[PDB]
């Protein structure tokens, strides 16, 4: 994932 929170 390119970002946290996913």
């Amino acid at each position, epitope marked *: 994932a390119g*970002x946290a929170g996913a």
Partner: antibody
Amino acid sequence: EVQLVESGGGLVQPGGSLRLSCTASGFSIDSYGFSWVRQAPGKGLEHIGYLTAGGRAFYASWAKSRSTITRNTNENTVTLKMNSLRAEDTAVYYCAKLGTGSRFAIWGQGTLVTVSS
Amino acid sequence: DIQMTQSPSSLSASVGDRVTITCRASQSVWRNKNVAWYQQKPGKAPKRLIYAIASLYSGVPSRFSGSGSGTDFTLTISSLQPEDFATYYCVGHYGSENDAYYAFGQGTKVEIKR
């Protein structure tokens, strides 16, 4: 090209609330994560909160109790609301996909919010 | 709370000089990868120069370079130019699969000696 147009009132009274929005053009806000950041005059950048591409909002500790970040998928907008404002909250507010690890980064033009009676 | 500490807070350098700005994160960034460097010029919104620690975004002069690892990151301007006057900020992304945060360094003011 892609654009991220910011809007919302500039003058807000102490004890009141600010409401800022950003409207995307050329892409979809409901498919990316977007932050709200502010910068007091002459000071540094401060991260307020992040709304993931999945629609979950996470707030920096200082902002959690007064801030609400939402999005309108039909309008293709993201919105910040902060209540119980004080002079300390005067700042230029930006919406931004910060692009810390990705190639896609986009910032709104910035909007000065002045807290004064 | 997550913190990024830049140093120096300000510096004065002559044109052609080599400038180094460091940025220490209080904990590991997302995927040990999500750090970017921003440049803010007088009266302007911040402009991203670097992403993923060391990826130079297209159009940015190559005299700007990012490096580092773990929780220690560095911005380098190989040959300072007058148009490089600005405040420079590191910004990191942090969290887990169910938590996401960002933090800005306090900024480094780069002044041009002349």
